[PDB]
């Protein structure tokens with residue numbers, strides 16, 4: 001997989017963010033995770049965590065997997081990095097997202113993220129509390 005440039009347009013919630021990618025505004029949905037909706041428990045904390053991560057970053061990159069790059073809503077499907085740290089993995093490691101939506105052929109970082117979930121769960125963090 002390859003990291004590609006993007007710039008932040010706007011934080012949305014725990015697992016979607018609006019980025020400019022190849023010069024075009026797009027909403028990205030983070031691969032392999034599910035944060036609570038803003039209206040749900042930990043939803044505001046997830047939104048806050050992603051917002052802080054992407055807004056503080058000097059460099060945002062989007063990494064597509066091997067499969068579908070857009071979902072049925074037209075959202076980009078990618079792993080998003082902030083100054084080299086994967087947002088997807090960070091949310092899971094903090095107990096603010098569950099590993100989820102693991103579809104065949106867009107699942108390169110599956111085992112990485114499950115390892116993070118196990119550790120958040122061992123720690124009883126947030127969702128696992």
Ligand SMILES: Cc1cn([C@H]2C[C@H](OP(=O)(O)O)[C@@H](COP(=O)(O)O)O2)c(=O)[nH]c1=O
Nearest residue numbers: 029030031032033034071072077101103106
């Ligand atoms: C993460 C992801 C979501 N989706 C679709 C599945 C779900 O369809 P449904 O809308 O029919 O439930 C939806 C969940 O995204 P959200 O968690 O943002 O609501 O997005 C994909 O198709 N591929 C993906 O990789």
Ligand SMILES: [Ca+2]
Nearest residue numbers: 015034035036
């Ligand atoms: Ca969600």
